[PDB]
Amino acid sequence: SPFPVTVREHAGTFFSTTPDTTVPVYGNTISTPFDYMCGEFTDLLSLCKIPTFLGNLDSNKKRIPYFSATNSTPATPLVTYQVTLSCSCMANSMLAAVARNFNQYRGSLNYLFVFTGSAMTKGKFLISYTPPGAGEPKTLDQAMQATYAIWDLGLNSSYNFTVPFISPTHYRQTSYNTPTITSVDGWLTVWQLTPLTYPLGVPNDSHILTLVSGGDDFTLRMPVTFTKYVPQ
Amino acid sequence: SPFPVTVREHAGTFFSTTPDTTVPVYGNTISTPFDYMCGEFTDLLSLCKIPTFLGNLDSNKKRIPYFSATNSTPATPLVTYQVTLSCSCMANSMLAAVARNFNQYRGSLNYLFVFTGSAMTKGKFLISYTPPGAGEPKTLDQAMQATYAIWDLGLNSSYNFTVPFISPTHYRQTSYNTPTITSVDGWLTVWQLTPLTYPLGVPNDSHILTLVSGGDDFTLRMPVTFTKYVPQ
Amino acid sequence: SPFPVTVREHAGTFFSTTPDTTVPVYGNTISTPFDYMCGEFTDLLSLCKIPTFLGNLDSNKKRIPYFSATNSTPATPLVTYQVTLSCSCMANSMLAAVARNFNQYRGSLNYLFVFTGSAMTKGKFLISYTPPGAGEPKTLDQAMQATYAIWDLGLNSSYNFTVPFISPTHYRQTSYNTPTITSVDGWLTVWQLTPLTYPLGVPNDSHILTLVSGGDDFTLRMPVTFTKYVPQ
């Protein structure tokens, strides 16, 4: 006999994210075999962990994947990156590209620096991560009072620096209208501890490539659409 | 996946008697305890079996719960009740009140007569139930040819008379527009067999209370609404 | 094959209290961990049992959390609270605040009195609960004829008085348009049995804090919305 039904108040509604399927109109069809394929990946996090380039500003305000250093120790940081997946600095990194499609993140961030100067060039940098609350570090004295690692040049070319996940909340926002304590987490500044030093016949300026990616315990969640824009 | 459904042709119909329930909008609520209560009854038939008063006509056409008898034996019945739960005679008895809300009945009917005359008054009545087919009994000779019981007055005050269920059909109608062989079942007449007899100093008229109710094997069925009327 | 269905007469209706859920449009989402939290409570009754302040009238008709007593024994009660969760007297107590969102209550009520006079001040009060039927008690003679407890001042500062649940019905209304025997349950009056007594150098007036809350066997039921009002 027919079953009595109570039509809910949302009849006919199309839920773009309902966790259910719809009617198949061309079933019993074989999906063209692709067993020969390679390169498949199943988690978008894989992408977030691939170190990608940061956009630094050239002397002519042009965007370049590195910063310069020479035979001197500035009283100010060579570069300053605000730790937000919203930083214009990492706007075109795979990390940010993926994060733009998610609401929150959690975990470590890896800032990879690759020294491209000559083999004869030496020097030491102090990479610091300053948590918020007391503002951006104004001096080396302040920067070294927070989380930091000293990078010494030599045989190995790069330094993998991790910005520890230090937050009042378990998750942090990927973007924001105005900075809040849940969307902005401090700064990463790299200072010149000792001047880049070298012999004669070597260009005064050395270029350090800069990249970012999510660390080992980095995660993103809540799929969303980012603010649309016109390509150019 | 969603289930394909075939909406029947009666969609949206409100069935006042569907044997199914509807949606609860205030559940998990305790029904105020009433375990202390007494007097509960679960079957309306209980009511039908309680002897209730018949309405007899007074000399001034007024309705009274009894009829009169005296020192004589009329050639006609003292009272005549047509066996129909529709009889104006039992219109206000609990039996009729309940029967009005049902379509058919079956079983015995109990006509209770209670002698209210003095203790010094004696006499005998012949209570007869005449099945239909040959019309109402015109004489005592005819009445005593059908189902009857002789009621003798004495120590016990009342007589419980049963109108046997004699019918061509298993069930009989409770009411009707025009009398049919399935809604009218004959007559119950009470005759004076011997005159009421008594000594001096005793009022000539004795009053016999009259009541009706369903018998032991009486039943009603099919709940319905009776012809509405304006109280007065 | 498709299933035949009978669309009930209430199709499309939105039941605000249906005991069923609706479609999830963003599932498989983790609720931000909060295991570190403390102070969680699961039953609103917990709140009802917390003694909260009653609003007594000041000599200038101002509302205060206490009443005065001195070296005399008035022939009238110091304070009178009608036992109704509707009493203007307990209007701002947590008990009343919660009760306003429920239809009925049952169980004990606790009236807590805290003596704030000096340590040198002594005295005795007679706290009485008069059930209805014969009106409010007009004298101490009448008050002490009902449920009462004598509160003697001393080392212990407060007295926890219980208004027994004495009712013709198992549950009682939380509010009402006009008082009925199911919404108003009598009065609680506190009398001065012996005058507050003290030595020289002590202020004549002592203040007794007054609070209410549901007792150990107090319960509320049937969630509802109270008569709205404009805050001020």
Partner: peptide
């Protein structure tokens, strides 16, 4: 991914979904 229904799919797996097959 986004499969949160308790009861099994009303349509066969071979109809509801494309049939995956290896050519080897």
């Amino acid at each position: 991914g986004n499969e949160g229904v308790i009861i099994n799919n009303y349509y066969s797996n071979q109809y509801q979904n494309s049939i995956d097959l290896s050519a080897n």
